[PDB]
Write a protein that binds this DNA or RNA. Structure first.
Lengths: 56, 48, 110, 150, 103, 117, 142
RNA sequence: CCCGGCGAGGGGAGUGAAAAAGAACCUGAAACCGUGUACGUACAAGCAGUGGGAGCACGCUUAGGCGUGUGACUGCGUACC
RNA sequence: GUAACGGGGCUAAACCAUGCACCGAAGCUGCGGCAGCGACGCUUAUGCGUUGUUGGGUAGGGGAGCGUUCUGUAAGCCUGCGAAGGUGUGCUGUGAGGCAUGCUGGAGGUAUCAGAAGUGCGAAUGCUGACAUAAGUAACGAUAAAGCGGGUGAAAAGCCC
């Protein structure tokens, strides 16, 4: 459209409260090693439930 | 020395209207000419 | 012991930086550095080097310890825009402004 | 303002200000609407007010004891070090020397001193005469001033 | 214990151990305020009095500050018409502290 | 004589905007909206000098009314009774004993009832 | 001097049991509203919701007196269908039997919010079954 | 010297009377976005102001009914040209 | 959307007859502050005391005062022993205004009182600058599309292979 007036700065922050960037919910270690993790993927060295993955 | 203690004769200084200064002043807008018409604008039209 | 890191004229609009930054306000340095790591975004790696640089000069130099270090200020400001002609109706040649950000990390033990 | 009679104009009633002239006084810079014209404020000076105001100041100058009135006050030459060395001896500072006799050896003197000045008694300046500490005078100046004042 | 007195054309309720405010006095901080013009003392039970200036009553007092307040502002105004005008006053006062009021 | 124009207003502005502290949004930060609000604020403040005293007298009247009504007389027969009863300059604000220690108020009513006709 | 005023922690309230079987709708209702503000008592304050806590013991046999009963239909227009829509005096007694007493005392209470704060202190229940035995009600005749 | 890609920016170390003079460097508002503190916002609605006010922090209030900031709640209340 | 008592309520809480009452405005009045002016006293270009009616006010008149730039006393005096400027607060006057003061600041500053005036902005759908806003909205320029691994490189779905 257009608008009536220039808006207040409280308005700008209420409009931005829901669009806000969302939590990662803490971190992972492997179930099967002393190696640090990426949640519910397999690491660059294939550790998750072992075997081998990403041999590139 | 006595300098800078002078002032004009009694009531001699009228001081006069400045106009156009403040809005809470009484004096201001138009000049003491009122709203709109030939005599409110800058000097043109009617002959003496 | 207090440290500023800035990166000024960095390639992001400051609105897009302020988004990520408000996730990590007040967090303490180690908890925020984990929160940033599991943010996949390219903005989050750009900011990492400046946040990490803040943290590194307390871990060294004039500082001692990083365990009570906290992100005391974290803020982003309008950097220098290069102005470009936007193609638009009836040969309308309106400005589109290609933004950069001035990014400030302040960490302190404070 | 010279160098363009151009109208930015292209009517009013197109969503904007009147944009009236590129020489209009409000047009950023280059000239404002009532900026100064050559000023001359000197008048006639009415002789009977002038000469009679002065009769007041000459009486007031003796009543405040500021008029010394030395007979043939003079120095050999128009040299400040000579007049000034005369002035230290008389215990005087920053005084208005008034000539009665328009001799060049006093009248070109006193030049280096900031707030010592020399003037002639013919048409004496009423604004200088209320400044300075004292009026040195001669009796020759008293003669010709009263004679401008009858 | 509560009482009524006259500050002037206005009447005031006040208690024992109460500091209370009225329009400025001539009386100073280092002087004694006393009120024989006590209109009632409300005692242990409601009083049945008709006639004021009760003789068997005092509010004994003191001034504790003579000062001037803050400046209040007065607007006289009429919209759209280009009439606006202003007056100030800050007003002097006395605070008094009640030591009196007999049982 | 170049006169600067506006280093006087910077102080006039600052007096208005200091009086407009405690006010919302633009009111504390824009001279244009500070100015509208500061004039309006003092007109009301000066109005309520008088208006406060009238608004309370209504609360004053209803509190002499609740004591009297518990004591089975109406406020207007009691106040008119007191008027007929001898002198007393009196006041509506008088009965503190109405809200608390409600055992009193009776001597004034008993007087008011006695003068009643 | 300045005026004294009341405060929310000092307000007493108490629980009152109001017998209604001799009464009629509006002569109960306007005394309840008064009391429900604290306008029966010395409030001496503009801003603190005082009131009493009121239990109505029954009220099922309250006559309206005169012919007003059969034209009182509590008109509302929530957001649908041409016409005003209504509900009968008879609905109010047959089901949720309070509602005739509730929406008699509603109209005596202020604007939006403040009138709701006065109202949530009043209860009627279904009638001759009130639950404030442990509360120890002081009886009141009006 | 620290971080970094050879980068960009900033800090530390050192320079000075001063870098709260660090290079767009003169002292420096307001528009601007962010931090830090006190206090508030889910019986809860309007020119956002006025009048009354629960509360809390601070000021040893010599505590002697007071100063400060904010303020649930609520009487009253229609911007300037 | 009741919505022709403002509403609840009221079949007497209505209306009518007689009469008493209360509440209800800066009105009527006293308290304390104060403006101008008649009368009188002092006796002044702009008053104050005693006494007095008085003081809502635009267009519009008329009188007075403040500051801003600069001059004159000011070639003097204060100044890195902390000046202009910046800003929060308090004091004070009817208002304009003026004064105190912590922080800041690294050189400047000052009345009285008169006179000269480019003389106080908030508006002209005004002019210029800094810079906000609707907005995390819309946009991917005939979709002569593209893939993923390795490599230059620190990094690669788009380069190079």
């Amino acid at each position: 459209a257009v608008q009536q007036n220039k808006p207040t700065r409280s308005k700008r922050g209420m409009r931005r409260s829901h669009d806000a960037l969302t939590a990662v919910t803490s971190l992972s270690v492997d179930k099967t090693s002393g190696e640090k993790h990426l949640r519910h993927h397999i690491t660059a060295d294939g550790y998750y439930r072992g075997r081998k993955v990403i041999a590139k | 020395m006595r300098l800078n203690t002078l002032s004009p004769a009694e009531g001699s200084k009228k001081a006069g209207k400045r106009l156009g200064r403040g809005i809470g002043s009484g004096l201001g807008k138009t000049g003491g000419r009122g709203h709109k018409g030939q005599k409110s604008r800058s000097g043109g039209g009617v002959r003496r | 012991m207090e440290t500023i890191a800035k990166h000024r004229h960095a390639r992001s609009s400051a609105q897009k930086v302020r988004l990520v930054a408000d996730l990590i306000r007040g967090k303490k340095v180690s908890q925020a550095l984990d929160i940033l790591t599991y943010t996949n975004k390219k903005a989050a790696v750009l900011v990492k080097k400046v946040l990490e640089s803040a943290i590194a000069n307390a871990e060294h130099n004039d500082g001692a310890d990083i365990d009570d270090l906290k992100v005391t200020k974290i803020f982003v400001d309008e950097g220098p825009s290069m102005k470009r002609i936007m193609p638009r109706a009836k040969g309308r040649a309106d400005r589109i402004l290609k933004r950069t950000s001035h990014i400030t990390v302040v960490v302190s033990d404070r | 303002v010279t160098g363009s009679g151009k109208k930015p104009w292209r009517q009013k009633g197109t969503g904007r200000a009147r944009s009236g002239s590129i020489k209009s006084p409000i047009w950023r810079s280059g000239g404002v609407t009532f900026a100064a014209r050559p000023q001359d404020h000197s008048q006639k000076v009415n002789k009977k007010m002038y000469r009679g105001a002065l009769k007041s100041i000459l009486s007031e100058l003796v009543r405040q004891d500021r008029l010394i009135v030395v007979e043939k006050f003079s120095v050999e030459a128009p040299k400040t070090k000579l007049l000034a060395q005369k002035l230290k001896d008389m215990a005087l500072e920053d005084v208005l020397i008034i000539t009665g006799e328009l001799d060049e050896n006093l009248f070109l003197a006193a030049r280096n001193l900031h707030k010592v000045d020399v003037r002639d008694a013919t048409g004496i300046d009423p604004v200088s005469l209320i400044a300075f500490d004292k009026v040195v005078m001669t009796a020759d100046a008293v003669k010709q001033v009263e004679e401008m004042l009858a | 214990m509560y009482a009524v007195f006259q500050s002037g054309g206005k009447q005031h309720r006040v208690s024992e151990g109460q500091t209370v405010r009225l329009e400025k006095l001539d009386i100073a901080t280092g002087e004694t305020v006393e009120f024989a013009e006590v209109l009632m003392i409300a005692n242990g039970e409601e009083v049945k009095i008709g006639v004021p200036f009760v003789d068997g009553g005092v509010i004994k007092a003191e001034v504790v500050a003579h000062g001037r307040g803050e400046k209040v502002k007065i607007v006289k105004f009429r919209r759209r018409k280009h009439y606006r005008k202003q007056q100030g006053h800050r007003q002097w006062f006395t605070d008094v502290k009640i030591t009196g009021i007999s049982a | 004589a170049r006169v600067k124009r506006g280093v006087i207003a910077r102080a006039r502005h600052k007096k208005i905007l200091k009086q407009a502290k405690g006010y919302y949004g633009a009111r504390s930060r824009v001279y244009r909206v500070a100015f509208q609000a500061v004039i309006k604020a003092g007109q009301y403040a000066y109005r309520d000098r008088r208006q406060r005293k009238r608004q309370f007298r209504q609360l004053w009247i209803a509190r002499i009314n609740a004591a009297a009504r518990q004591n089975g007389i109406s406020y207007s027969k009691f106040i008119n009774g007191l008027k007929k009863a001898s002198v007393e300059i009196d006041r509506k604000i008088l009965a503190d004993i109405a809200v608390f220690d409600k055992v009193a108020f009776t001597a004034l009513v008993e007087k008011a009832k006695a003068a009643l006709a | 001097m300045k005026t004294f005023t009341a405060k929310p922690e000092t307000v007493k309230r108490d629980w009152y049991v109001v017998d209604a079987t001799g009464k009629t709708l509006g002569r109960l209702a306007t005394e309840l509203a008064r009391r429900l503000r604290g306008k029966h008592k010395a409030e001496y304050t503009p801003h603190v919701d005082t009131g009493d806590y009121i239990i109505v013991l029954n009220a099922d046999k309250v006559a309206v007196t005169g012919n007003k009963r059969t034209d009182k239909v509590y008109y509302h227009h929530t957001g649908h269908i041409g016409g005003i829509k209504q509900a009968t005096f008879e609905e109010m007694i047959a089901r949720r039997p309070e509602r005739v007493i509730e929406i008699a005392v509603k109209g005596m209470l202020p604007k939006g919010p403040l009138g709701r704060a006065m109202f949530r202190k009043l209860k009627v229940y279904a009638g001759n079954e009130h639950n404030h035995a442990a509360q120890q009600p002081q009886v009141l005749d009006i």
